[PDB]
Design an enzyme around this catalytic site. Structure first.
Site, short mmCIF file in Angstrom:
data_model
loop_
_atom_site.label_atom_id
_atom_site.label_comp_id
_atom_site.label_asym_id
_atom_site.label_seq_id
_atom_site.Cartn_x
_atom_site.Cartn_y
_atom_site.Cartn_z
N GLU A 59 0.85 -1.17 0.00
CA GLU A 59 0.00 0.00 0.00
C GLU A 59 0.89 1.23 0.00
OE1 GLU A 59 -2.18 0.72 3.66
OE2 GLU A 59 -4.03 1.11 2.55
N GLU A 109 -8.25 10.33 2.72
CA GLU A 109 -8.36 9.27 3.71
C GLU A 109 -8.56 9.86 5.09
OE1 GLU A 109 -5.17 6.40 3.99
OE2 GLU A 109 -6.26 5.28 5.52
#
Length: 185
Positions: A78, A172
């Site tokens: 990620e 996010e």
């Protein structure tokens, strides 16, 4: 360029009002959330892509990141290129720095344990990060020359997987509230 991917994931906590706008535009209103990731980009990421964006609105009231976000498989990784954040600047194991698109970024690596991944369920995986030393002003046309980061990461032994998954300019948040409006191309 035309974006072809819409990312809208939430762990179910709190309110996440994500709007899939026209073209590469999207907006998000969130409050008292768990973890969530929203953004627009491409179904298949590329190490040679140049991402352009304009955050018309960047108003997090707590922990939130304005960041390039993506995944690779084999191995599962990620990655992030954080241009701005809320009350918490993400950090990890310092590797070095990289200058790109007018700013200086610190390079970090971290690991997630028994956390949800792109394939669902939970597992342990590594995260690659490029975090601007100071918040990038928003409201302007910004560019992220991803190859600069990929090459810098490579010189620190941070190699990405061979199977590229999505790549998006996202918002996010983690247990916070706020608003954002971003246009990607």
């Amino acid at each position: 360029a035309s974006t072809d991917y819409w990312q809208n994931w939430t762990d179910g906590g709190g309110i996440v009002n994500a709007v899939n706008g026209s073209g590469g535009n999207y907006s998000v209103n969130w409050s008292n959330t768990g973890d969530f990731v929203v953004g627009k980009g491409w179904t298949t990421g590329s190490p040679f892509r140049t991402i352009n964006y304009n955050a018309g609105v960047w108003a997090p009231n707590g922990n939130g990141y304005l960041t390039l976000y993506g995944w690779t498989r084999s191995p599962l990784i990620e990655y992030y290129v954080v241009d701005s954040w809320g009350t918490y600047r993400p950090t990890g194991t310092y590797k070095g720095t990289v200058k790109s698109d007018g700013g200086t970024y610190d390079i970090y690596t971290t690991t997630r344990y028994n956390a949800p991944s792109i394939d669902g369920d939970r597992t342990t995986f590594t995260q690659y990060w490029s975090v601007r030393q100071s918040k990038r002003p928003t409201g302007s046309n910004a560019t992220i020359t991803f190859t600069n980061h990929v090459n810098a990461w490579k010189s620190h032994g941070m190699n990405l997987g061979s199977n590229w998954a999505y790549q998006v300019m996202a918002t996010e948040g983690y247990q916070s509230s706020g608003s954002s409006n971003v246009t990607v191309w």
